[PDB]
Amino acid sequence: SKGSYECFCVDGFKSMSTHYGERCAADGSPPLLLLPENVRIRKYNTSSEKFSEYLEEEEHIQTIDYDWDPE
Amino acid sequence: EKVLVVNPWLTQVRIFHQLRYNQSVSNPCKQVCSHLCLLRPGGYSCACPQGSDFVTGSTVQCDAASELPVT
Amino acid sequence: EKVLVVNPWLTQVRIFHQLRYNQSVSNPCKQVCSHLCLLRPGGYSCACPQGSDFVTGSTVQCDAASELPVT
Ligand SMILES: *[C@@H]1O[C@H](CO)[C@@H](O[C@@H]2O[C@H](CO)[C@@H](O)[C@H](O[C@@H]3O[C@H](CO)[C@@H](O)[C@H](O)[C@@H]3O)[C@H]2NC(C)=O)[C@H](O)[C@H]1NC(C)=O
Ligand SMILES: *[C@@H]1O[C@H](CO)[C@@H](O[C@@H]2O[C@H](CO)[C@@H](O)[C@H](O[C@@H]3O[C@H](CO)[C@@H](O)[C@H](O)[C@@H]3O)[C@H]2NC(C)=O)[C@H](O)[C@H]1NC(C)=O
Ligand SMILES: *[C@@H]1O[C@H](CO)[C@@H](O[C@@H]2O[C@H](CO)[C@@H](O)[C@H](O)[C@H]2NC(C)=O)[C@H](O)[C@H]1NC(C)=O
Ligand SMILES: [Ca+2]
DSSP states (O other), X not given: OTTOOOOOOOTTOOEEEETTEEEEOOSSSOOEEEEEOSSOEEEXXXXXXXXXXXXXXXXXXXXXXXXXXXX | OOOOOOOTTOOOOEEXXXXXXXXXXXXXXXXXXXXXXXXXXXXXXXXXXXXXXXOTTOSSOBSSOOOOOOO | OOOOOOOTTOOOOOOOOSTTSOTTOOOOOOSOOSXXXXXXXXXXXXXXXXXXXXXXXXXXXXXXXXXXXXX
């Protein structure tokens, strides 16, 4: 705009005023991290801050990607 | 900021969330392709497995025998 | 036989049980010692901290000031 602008955020992001600036939330379950080790893949809830068991008794893992709920 | 500490066996971090991959991106493929329908800017293209070629005169059907999807 | 698999940061396995350390082994020390009462085959001995020596003529009391046990 003429000497002005808006920090709008796209669909699926609720505007949430935060500390040291404003951001937009995740509009759903807090993100997990996937953490692959040679023998297992581990999950971690970024909000709950707890590991939980996932793929185990494996060997020589190296990299990870995912498809969100295909079915 | 530090989040957490894991094995030197750690090989990735990946955020497992749906907003991370926009699910409402329509596939331009018209099901015309016989085996593979790769993407390209503003459209798609046909291809067939390695060590095979298109049936002469056509850019869709390839001579390699089709295989059933895995259950 | 294998038991479990864990980080290359593993440094030791130690069995935490009471039968591994016979608890009914009586300490031969007669509380005579001033600071330390070390063991030896069939008996015990007196000693005092580094940079200190026994009071002349005695093999029990040492010149270093005693310190209260830590809570
Ligand atoms: C994920 O990708 C989809 C597209 O596959 C994005 O949807 C589009 O988002 C724009 C943003 O403002 C909307 O306008 C689109 O709506 C459509 O707009 C055109 C004109 O440009 C009209 O002709 C259509 O009738 C319609 O109103 C919208 N399109 C669709 C198909 O939804 C989406 O924003 C994006 N999401 C994220 C999180 O990246
Ligand atoms: C842990 O150490 C204790 C000793 O500090 C062991 O106890 C002794 O075990 C023997 C095994 O047969 C018993 O005889 C002992 O009983 C006494 O033995 C003396 C002879 O040395 C006799 O004169 C006594 O009349 C009496 O029979 C017993 N001593 C005590 C004080 O209990 C114990 O076995 C050991 N446990 C393990 C698991 O190693
Ligand atoms: C990660 O942790 C968050 C909490 O920080 C979970 O969110 C809650 O999950 C319960 C599950 O029954 C829901 O009923 C609540 O409504 C959720 N609360 C919020 C703040 O939305 C979340 O489910 C956890 N995800 C995983 C997979 O562990
Ligand atoms: Ca402006």
